[PDB]
Structure formats: C-alpha cells, structure tokens
Design an enzyme around this catalytic site. Structure first.
Site, mmCIF file in Angstrom:
data_model
loop_
_atom_site.group_PDB
_atom_site.id
_atom_site.type_symbol
_atom_site.label_atom_id
_atom_site.label_comp_id
_atom_site.label_asym_id
_atom_site.label_seq_id
_atom_site.Cartn_x
_atom_site.Cartn_y
_atom_site.Cartn_z
ATOM 1 N N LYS A 168 50.013 40.140 39.366
ATOM 2 C CA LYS A 168 49.730 38.713 39.435
ATOM 3 C C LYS A 168 50.905 37.914 38.895
ATOM 4 C CE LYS A 168 44.679 38.148 39.232
ATOM 5 N NZ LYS A 168 44.675 37.351 40.484
ATOM 6 N N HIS A 203 39.209 40.200 40.847
ATOM 7 C CA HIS A 203 37.892 40.690 41.248
ATOM 8 C C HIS A 203 38.014 41.883 42.182
ATOM 9 C CE1 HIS A 203 35.530 37.443 39.488
ATOM 10 N NE2 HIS A 203 34.439 37.968 40.017
HETATM 11 O O1 VO4 Z 1 42.031 36.621 40.793
HETATM 12 V V1 VO4 Z 1 40.522 36.313 40.609
HETATM 13 O O2 VO4 Z 1 40.291 34.784 40.898
HETATM 14 O O3 VO4 Z 1 39.703 37.159 41.625
HETATM 15 O O4 VO4 Z 1 40.107 36.627 39.130
#
Ligand code: VO4
Length: 574
Positions: free
Chosen positions: A350, A401
């Site tokens: 991320k 998620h």
């Molecule tokens: O990246 V999430 O918005 O699925 O936590």
C-alpha cells in the site's frame, strides 16, 4: 468508571464453553472496545497482529502440555537463540490454566498501560479512560472463563512465561508511527481525503472537551517495511497497479476502472450510481471499518471462523474435548498468523505504491469526459456515530480487506480440505455456513442522529437501525470473493485492488473493458468459475506477480501452511 454497555453478539452461547473459543472471544471484545474508546492497537494491520500474537501464545502453551503428532510448536525449548526459546512446562500439565495464563498475560501486555517508559511518545495519546474500559474487559473475563482461572497454578504461570517470550519477540511498539511521513501529490498519488482533509483532536486525550488541534492522519506508513513478519518464509510482491511504473501504459484498464468506480461505488442517491440494493448490502456487510462497538476486519473474520470451527468440529462436546481444543488451537493460530502477515504485506505494498483512492482518482482525474470533480462514494460506514461515511486513511492498492480475506479463507480451505469435502487447493471448496450475521447489518447497530453515548446501550440511542440480514455462504471461495468486491461497492477500492479485473469481471470484445447489464451495473463472474490466474509485471523485479489483494493473501496463506507454521527466519527479517 462506568462500563460501556456492549451489544449482544449473534452467536450460540455454547461456543464460549470451550476455553480456546472463550479466549479468542476476549481478544475480539478488546478489539471492539479499543476501537470505541481509542485505546492501543487500533486500525487493520495492528489489530490483526494482536490476534496473531494471542493465538501464537495460546497455541504454544497448549501444545507444550498436550504434544501434537502431525506438527510441532511454533518455537521450541531447544532453540539456542534465547529470543526463540520456548519455556518448558517442568511439571505443568493443566492445559486449561496454561492457555489462561498465556491469554491473560498476552492481552494484558498488549492492552494495559505501558508503564515501562513506552507510555511516552508511543502510548502518549490514549486517555486513562480508554485503559480503564479495557481493564474492565480483562477483569471480568477472568471471572467468566470456563472452568475458572487459578493464578496460583504452575500451569498458569507457565502460560505466562510463554506469553512473555512471544510478546518480547513480536511486539512492535512503534508500528503505527507516521512521524516523518508526508504525501507526494501528483496523479495516482495518495493524499489527504478530500472529504476529511484534516481532523480536530483534543490537545489532551484526558480532556476531550478541552482545546483541539488540526491533525492529519496516515495509517502505519512504515509498518509493512520495518516490522517483524510472523510465519512468512519470503517477501511478497504485487504487479505494478494500472497507471504506474511498468504498467503505466495500461490506460484502457485504468479508464474503465474509473468508469466502474463511479457506477458501482457512488453515493446512494447519485444518478450515476448503478449499484443495486443487494450490492449495497454486500458492501456494508464486510465493512468493520474500525467503528464504535464493532472494531476492525480481523474481528469479523474471526467471528466467521468461529462459526466454521464449531460447524465442522469432530466431536459434539464443546466443553470437554481435547480433540476439539487441539483443533481450535491449531486452526486459530494458522488463521490469525496468516491474517497478521497479510496485514504486513498489504500495508507494505500500500505504502510502496501510494496509489490514490477512487474518490481522489475520480475527482482529480482532470479530464472533462472521465472524472467527476464532485463525486461522492457510499464510503466506509460510520456506524454507531453521527459522522458521515469516510474512506480508510491509507493508500488503495492492494485492498486491505481483500488481502486479509484471501489469507484467512485460503488458510481455512487448506486446513479443511479432505475433511469437509475435496477440492484442488486453487479451486472452489464446499465449506458452507449459514445464520451468519454481520454487526454492520444486525438490526441493532445504527447510524446515530447524535454523538454516541458510551454510558447507554445502543438500543436506547436514536438513529436509523441497520437492517438485519442473515446470510448463508456455499464456500470459503465465495466469502473470499464477496469480502473483496464489497470494497468496490463502498467505492473505496479500484477493481484491481481486489484482483485482476480479467479474473473477476465479464469481458467484452474490447480489451480491458468489461460487461455491464441493461442498467449499467458491472457484471461479475460466477464465484464457481473464478480463478486468480492473471499476473502482471513489476518495474523493479523480473517475473510475473499477483494483481490485487486476494491473490496476495492466497499466496501468503499457502506459504505459511506449506511450511507448517514456522517462524520467519530471522535472517530475512527487515
Ligand atoms: O484497503 V481497505 O479500504 O480494503 O482497508
């Protein structure tokens, strides 16, 4: 202090007659309470880490006293490395008290005030009330534990020793630090949420009504790259997201992704929103976005796993069955460790790519015929509060998620294969469950008209009650799929954050452009036909890598499982 009135959990109370399930339950209670009071270990990656630590300690406390045949403990007593040397029972033979000691020690170390200096800087932001509320939970748990807790037993003390080792080894005090981080604005780049660019927080957590101050939050930007992995035997990577690096030429995919984003994840009343009422339900069902009395995603995954565990147990007696105790102790360690590592790598990727969320992508697109400068998403539900829908304070790719779900459910699949049915490890299973209720849609929780009141039960507080929806699922393959696409429905994930669009959507004659129904809604492939095969390239590495959270999670679970839950070799730690 006045204890917070927690709403009732939709689960047979018999579950908690089993001490492994009971201690798992306590961890879940602390999860939701800490997210209600703003205590330690909040957020997706760290809340997962806490459960992994809890179950690792339980796992070793139990299997030290009740030795397994097909596998061994995570740590061993004969390790030359003191940091990885597991304590020896030396007479202790009460597994119930061993598990209790491990669980109580671990949870206390995790949630109680870091009096040992750590209170400064790291914990210097949590109110005394937060610690008080968490302590209440721990205190009554001792009194609620099946069979009671004998703190004087040698077995109990042994469990504590086990917990000390795991805590000292795996705890990451500065995990959620954001000091020194600042966004790098630009196309495809993560930056402050346009709907919540800044928040006013009290200068003193102990006086929430006193002076506030502007705060810009960034959730755990350094955690993934610096933290100690649990059981992964390698580093995991994802293909570059459409629009970035080696895949910067994937414009047709990106453009269509923007299109699907607007149609599937917009606010309920926008004319451009084509998402159906049922799809809206699927979106909220899997949320658990750190809300009051609800907690984070790892909590829901464990709630589902608890049901699967009891539904497929070998013996009917939940209370007195070593077969069941061992089964649960083993399953939960595998699942929660997989979840912890999934959190580490989804976060690592991320913040590596810093890909922007659909809200910013659509708004700041810049092209008159593609973007919508005033677009709004269905967003992450602000449950049990009067705040409006937001979007998680961290980059989009890959979906947290999706990665969590990929890991947790692939682990469940590997574990039950040949026991519940038979399937190829990469093909749909038959692990069905029913009567599964999400606290996001249980007929009790709601969207309040006024600020949440922690001294009153949720039922006595005015607001719009969430419709109670009772679900049934045919397999963990379905759970995995739906958990991933729910984020597309909320408008917080791009289609490629879940998986390669080619693996989940219905293709058309035009490449990178997918099918839509009569009314414009995106059409998904049937769960039974979905195969996560499409891989992509990385600018910095040769070879093909998985695309999206689900494939990454699957990969992590398989690795951990294939290695029989073995510690990450210290040589490959950051
Ligand atoms: O990246 V999430 O918005 O699925 O936590």
């Amino acid at each position: 202090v006045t204890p917070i009135p927690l709403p009732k959990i939709d689960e047979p109370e018999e579950y908690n007659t089993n001490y492994i399930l009971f201690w798992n339950h306590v961890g879940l209670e602390l999860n939701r309470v800490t997210h209600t009071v703003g205590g330690p270990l909040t957020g997706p990656p760290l809340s997962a880490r806490a459960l992994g630590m809890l179950h690792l300690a339980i796992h070793d406390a139990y299997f030290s006293i009740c030795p397994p045949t097909d596998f061994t403990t995570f740590l061993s007593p004969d390790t030359e490395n003191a940091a990885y040397r597991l304590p020896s029972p030396n007479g202790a033979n009460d597994a119930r008290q061993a598990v209790a000691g491990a669980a109580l020690k671990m949870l206390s170390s995790l949630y109680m005030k870091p009096v040992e200096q750590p209170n400064p800087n790291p914990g210097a932001n949590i109110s005394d009330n937060a610690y008080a509320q968490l302590g209440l939970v721990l205190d009554r748990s001792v009194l609620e534990a099946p069979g009671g807790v004998d703190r004087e037993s040698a077995s109990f003390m042994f469990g504590e020793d086990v917990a000390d080792v795991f805590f000292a080894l795996l705890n990451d005090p500065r995990g959620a630090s954001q000091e020194g981080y600042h966004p790098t604005p630009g196309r495809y780049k993560f930056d402050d949420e346009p709907t919540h660019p800044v928040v006013l927080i009290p200068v003193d957590p102990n006086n929430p009504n006193g002076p506030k101050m502007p705060f810009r939050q960034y959730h755990a930007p350094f955690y993934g790259k610096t933290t100690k992995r649990f059981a992964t035997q390698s580093e995991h990577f994802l293909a570059d997201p459409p629009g970035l690096r080696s895949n910067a030429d994937e414009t047709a995919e990106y453009d269509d992704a923007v299109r699907v984003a607007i149609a599937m994840g917009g606010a309920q009343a926008l004319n451009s929103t084509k998402r159906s009422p049922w799809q809206t339900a699927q979106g909220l069902y899997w949320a658990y976005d750190g809300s009051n009395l609800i907690g984070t995603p790892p909590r829901f995954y464990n709630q589902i796993v608890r049901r699967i565990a009891v539904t497929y147990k070998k013996e009917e007696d939940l209370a007195n069955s070593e077969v069941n105790n061992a089964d649960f102790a083993r399953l939960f360690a595998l699942v929660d460790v997989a979840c912890t590592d999934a959190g580490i790598f989804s976060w690592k990727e991320k913040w590596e790519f810093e890909f922007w969320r659909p809200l910013s992508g659509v708004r700041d697109d810049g092209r008159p015929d593609h973007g919508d400068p005033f677009w709004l998403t269905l967003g992450a539900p602000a449950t049990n509060t009067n705040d409006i829908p937001f979007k998680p304070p961290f980059p989009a790719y890959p979906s947290g998620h999706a990665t969590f779900g990929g890991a947790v459910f692939q682990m469940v699949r590997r574990y039950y294969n040949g026991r519940v049915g038979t399937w190829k490890d990469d093909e749909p299973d038959n692990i069905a469950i029913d009567m599964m209720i999400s606290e996001e849609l249980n007929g009790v929780n709601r969207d309040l008209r006024q600020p949440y009141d922690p001294t009153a039960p949720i039922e006595d507080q005015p607001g719009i009650v969430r419709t109670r929806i009772v679900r049934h699922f045919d397999s963990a393959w379905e759970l995995m799929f739906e958990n991933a696409i729910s984020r597309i429905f909320l408008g917080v994930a791009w289609r490629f954050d879940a998986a390669a669009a080619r693996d989940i959507l219905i293709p058309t004659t035009t490449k990178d452009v997918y099918a839509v129904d009569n009314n414009g809604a995106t059409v998904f492939q049937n769960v039974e036909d979905i195969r996560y095969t499409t891989r992509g390239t990385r600018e910095d590495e040769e070879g093909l890598f998985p695309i999206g959270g689900v494939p990454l999670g699957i990969e992590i679970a398989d690795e951990i499982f294939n290695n029989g839950l073995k510690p990450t070799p210290p040589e490959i730690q950051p």
